[PDB]
Amino acid sequence: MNTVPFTSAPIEVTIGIDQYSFNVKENQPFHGIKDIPIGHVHVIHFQHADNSSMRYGYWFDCRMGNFYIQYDPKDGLYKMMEERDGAKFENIVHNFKERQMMVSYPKIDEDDTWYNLTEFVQMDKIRKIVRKDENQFSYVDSSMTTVQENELSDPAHSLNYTVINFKSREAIRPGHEMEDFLDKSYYLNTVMLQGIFKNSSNYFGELQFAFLNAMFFGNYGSSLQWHAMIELICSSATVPKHMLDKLDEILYYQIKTLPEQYSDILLNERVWNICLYSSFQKNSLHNTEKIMENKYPELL
Amino acid sequence: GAMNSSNYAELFNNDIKLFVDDTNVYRVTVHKTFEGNVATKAINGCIFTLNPKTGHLFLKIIHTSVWAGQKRLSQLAKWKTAEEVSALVRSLPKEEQPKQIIVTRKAMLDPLEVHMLDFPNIAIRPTELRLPFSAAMSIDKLSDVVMKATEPQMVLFNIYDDWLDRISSYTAFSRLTLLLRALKTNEESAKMILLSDPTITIKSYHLWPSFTDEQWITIESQMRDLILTEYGRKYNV
Structure with a gap:
């Protein structure tokens, strides 16, 4: 079990850890989150009571250091920071926990939800997508743009997702124009799986990471990536049987975790009707299909 | 973007452009078989490729052999049309290659776009106009040459004669x-x-x-x- 202390809570903010969240009042004595399961990635995130725009947060893993949170009044926002003095860190942790000013990561033990959403997410893959290699954590917000958006402006602040484009030379073998554009198996298996991602698990991890960036920050480009990685699989006639069956579980839990009121900007009508009813893989997302129809029948 | 009655006179400036009409690429007859089921017979077709400024018409004849042993033909027709327009663009010297191609039917957009990937500076566009290029096989000499062909063949016309x-x-x-x-x-x-x-x-x-x-x-x-x-x-x- 790990901890992420906070120096202080100067401003009213809604704080999130993973899929949990708390209201913290201006200069309430709040000092951090305890009982955080070691073993997966986590994300802590923020929405100020004054500016319901820009949700922002940090992705991290306690196994890579000791991280804490401090407000920066010059920049007006909470900043993740690493403490390198190990002794100094366990010291502030124990004092605050004794003073009990910390909330506990509230994990019901039946709930595999977080593990189901982060199963394939790795910090190391993450820090390639959010390049800032002087920190062991990764910052994301609502407004950051992807590299594919930039092409169609500031690159330090870019989400370097893997670029998928169905009408590109990459995706279309000359002479197999019709074949490849109706049946993307080429693109998926050789170009993307074997070629760029190397294995199905990196792929799923990026897809899973893109979903969460969309859910927590409303990052519109993260939404686009997630939908395209889904479309690539569903629009392929030849997919490993292990990947179909895992994708059904991945999507199921994503759809299950989504706030009910945000279905309109976060789900792309066309991709989903294609995946579930038009594509090669209609028959292969029994779990994802059943949950979509009983929760969001309107979108379909 | 799309071509309509606003941006109508663009067709006639000095930017090379072509219309591609694909309505007569895949042409069948419908008949009853001996057991009374319905069957189709294919006849020769034509891609109808026109330079509205100069009248130059690139009439690609689609021989019924192209269809032999193929499924989802009406779908394939779109892709065969985009294949041949592409080969035509490749066959032309650079200075003659169009800057835009306007498809008379929106379902041609994705096939052409795909087949033209080697030409990213050639804009593929739809249209909202209701052009009447399917009537092209009402022109006696267009229909005759199409009907009489024995192999794939290209035939150049000026559809404006000498006007x-x-x-x-x-x-x-x-x-x-x-x-x-x-x-x-x-x-x-x-x-x-x-x-x-x-x-x-x-x-x-x-x-x-x-x-x-x-x-x-x-x-x-x-x-x-x-x-x-x-x-x-x-x-x-």
């Missing part, structure tokens, strides 16, 4: 669509109107008759009147 010697592209293109519009709506009449007077002949290198200026007025008046007459009959007006 540009005396009228502008804009006007030329308006005559064309008027004539095809009329031929689409009532072929028998349209053709009656064009050929009634046996003393006005079609030059062997031409498609339409050699009307004088005055006669083209009478003809255009008569095609207008035809198209009006047929609309009343269509909707009871």
Whole structure:
């Protein structure tokens, strides 16, 4: 079990850890989150009571250091920071926990939800997508743009997702124009799986990471990536049987975790009707299909 | 973006552009078989590729052999059309390659776009106009050459005969669509109107008759009147 202390809570903010969240009042004595399961990635995130725009947060893993949170009044926002003095860190942790000013990561033990959403997410893959290699954590917000958006402006602040484009030379073998554009198996298996991602698990991890960036920050480009990685699989006639069956579980839990009121900007009508009813893989997302129809029948 | 009545005169500036009409690429007949089930027979088709400014027509003939042993033919037709327009662009010298291609039917967008990936600076565009290029096989010499072909074959025409010697592209293109519009709506009449007077002949290198200026007025008046007459009959007006 790990901890992420906070120096202080100067401003009213809604704080999130993973899929949990708390209201913290201006200069309430709040000092951090305890009982955080070691073993997966986590994300802590923020929405100020004054500016319901820009949700922002940090992705991290306690196994890579000791991280804490401090407000920066010059920049007006909470900043993740690493403490390198190990002794100094366990010291502030124990004092605050004794003073009990910390909330506990509230994990019901039946709930595999977080593990189901982060199963394939790795910090190391993450820090390639959010390049800032002087920190062991990764910052994301609502407004950051992807590299594919930039092409169609500031690159330090870019989400370097893997670029998928169905009408590109990459995706279309000359002479197999019709074949490849109706049946993307080429693109998926050789170009993307074997070629760029190397294995199905990196792929799923990026897809899973893109979903969460969309859910927590409303990052519109993260939404686009997630939908395209889904479309690539569903629009392929030849997919490993292990990947179909895992994708059904991945999507199921994503759809299950989504706030009910945000279905309109976060789900792309066309991709989903294609995946579930038009594509090669209609028959292969029994779990994802059943949950979509009983929760969001309107979108379909 | 899409081409409509606002951006209509763009067709006639000096930017090379082509229309691609694919309505006559895959042409069948429908007949009953001996057991009474329904079957199709394919006949020769044509891709209809036109430079509205100069009148240059690139009539790619689609031989029924192209279809042999193939499924989802109406789908394949779109992709075969985009294949051949591509080969045509590749076959032309750079300075002649179009800057835009306008597809008469939106379902051609994705096939062409895909087949033209090697030409990213060639904009593929749809249109909202209702062009009448399916009536192209109402032009006796276009249909004859299509019907008579024994292999894939390309045939060059100028669909304006020699009209540009005396009228502008804009006007030329308006005559064309008027004539095809009329031929689409009532072929028998349209053709009656064009050929009634046996003393006005079609030059062997031409498609339409050699009307004088005055006669083209009478003809255009008569095609207008035809198209009006047929609309009343269509909707009871």
